[PDB]
Every structure is written in C-alpha cells, then in structure tokens.
Write a protein that binds this ligand. Structure first.
Ligand SMILES: [Cl-]
Ligand SMILES: [Cl-]
Ligand SMILES: [Zn+2]
Ligand SMILES: [Zn+2]
Lengths: 21, 28, 28, 21, 21, 28, 28, 27, 21, 28, 21, 21
C-alpha cells in the first residue's frame, strides 16, 4: 500500500495523489 | 514498526493537503 | 474557511492515532 | 460530518473512534 | 504577504508553489 | 489572536511538501 | 531518503517558531 | 473550546522544543 | 495560564520557557 | 538521538490528545 | 520511560494513557 | 547542511537559529 510505496523513498505529490479517492 | 508509524502520520497529513475535496481512504 | 482546514488537519492526525490498524475514510 | 461535530466543541477519544473504519 | 494570502483563504497547490525557489 | 501564527505553522508544513527538492523562502 | 524528508518537516516547523519574523531559507 | 484545543497542541510542540532536557508540565 | 497568555497573543521563546521545569 | 527526538515530538502530540483535561508531565 | 517503551514499539492508546497525570 | 547536522543529532533552538534569516 502507500506505506510500502512511500516510507523508504520519497513519494511525489503526483504519486501521493494516487491514494485520493 | 515505530518508523512506519511516524511515516504514516506524515503521509496522512500529505494526503489531506493533496487530496483536497476528494478526500481519501487510508488503510495501513 | 481557514479555521476548518486547520481543524481538519488535527482531526486527521487524531484519527490516524485512534483508528490504528482499522484505518479510516476522510471526506471533506 | 466530523468537522461539524468536532471543530467547535472538542471530541473525546470515544467520539473520534466513531469515525474509524 | 503569504499569511495575508494563504491564512485568509486556503491556498491551492498552485498558489503554494509561489513560495518555492 | 494567534490565528495567523497557528496558520503559519501549517503553511510552512504544506510548503515543505509542495516545494520538494526546490526548497522555499518564507518570511512572516 | 524518507527519514531525511520527515526530519526536514520537523526542522521547518521548528524554524518557523525559532526564526519568527526573520523568516528563513530552506533547502531539501 | 476547540480553538484552545488546537492552540494547546502547538503550545506543547513548542515547549517540547524549548524546554528540551528540562521537561515540562501541561494541563 | 499558558492558554490565557499564549493563545490570545503570540508568546516569545522567552515567555514560553517560563512553563518549563 | 534524532530518531528518538522526532518520535518524542509525536509522543507529546499523542499524549496531549489522549490525556485530555488530565494533562501530563514530560521530560526526556 | 515513555521513549524507551513507545519508540521501540508502537504504544496503544491505553499504553500512552499510562503517562498522563 | 541542516540535515546532516540536525537529523543525526538533536539541534537546539540556538543551533536552529543558525539557519534563519
Ligand atoms: Cl518523524
Ligand atoms: Cl491550528
Ligand atoms: Zn514526524
Ligand atoms: Zn494547528
């Protein structure tokens, strides 16, 4: 999930926006 | 697990900003 | 309003802690 | 919603937990 | 200023980008 | 009131995220 | 590095309180 | 009052930074 | 209290230290 | 010790919410 | 202390409440 | 940089002020 994706390498705003509903 | 906890805290703050009116579903 | 945005920031932080493994759905 | 219920009068832990999945 | 602008009304991501180098 | 001060605290957090590697300049 | 990233967020919050009306530059 | 609640959150953050090794009381 | 003093106007680092141990 | 330092920031925030009107004493 | 207990493992709400007055 | 100084060891408000304007 988001934790796997973004807690070791920084996620961009674009990447984060993937987790908006 | 504490580092993942601390990360998640910042992730939900980030999503709160980025998602705006859409909102978000957060599942650990 | 700005105050609502700031309050929302703190609510998400609070829910992150209280909900734990259950997660949450937040929609403004 | 949670903003209307919790941004004028303080919500307790119990009240906040109502909004969890 | 920025308090004037972004603490009077919520700034969009675009408006926040104004403050970036 | 301290509203501007509290808002500013959230603002710089948001700017930190937005500006990414670019960094920022902020003065209140 | 996400740990540097989280740390920077806290640095900015702290600098906001410390630097006050002087403002600050920040470089990620 | 939520406004005092939110302010207090920032106060304890500030005191954490300021008081350092000395510690603090807060109610 | 600290709320009466520091939530009605901005408290300096100096004023804040008076609530340290 | 910044690992623990940032954790402590989050701990105080969490205790602030959990303890409610009881308040707390904190010292690293 | 709380750092030893709660920065090595995640403390539950109930564990955190141990450190209230 | 501020990261190498203050993310590996605790920086006091006095150490932080070095990075102000
Ligand atoms: Cl952190
Ligand atoms: Cl606030
Ligand atoms: Zn953090
Ligand atoms: Zn706030």
């Amino acid at each position: 999930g988001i934790v796997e994706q973004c807690c070791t390498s920084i996620c961009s705003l674009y990447q984060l926006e993937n987790y908006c509903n | 697990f504490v580092n993942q906890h601390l990360c998640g805290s910042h992730l939900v703050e980030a999503l709160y900003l980025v998602c705006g009116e859409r909102g978000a579903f957060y599942t650990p």
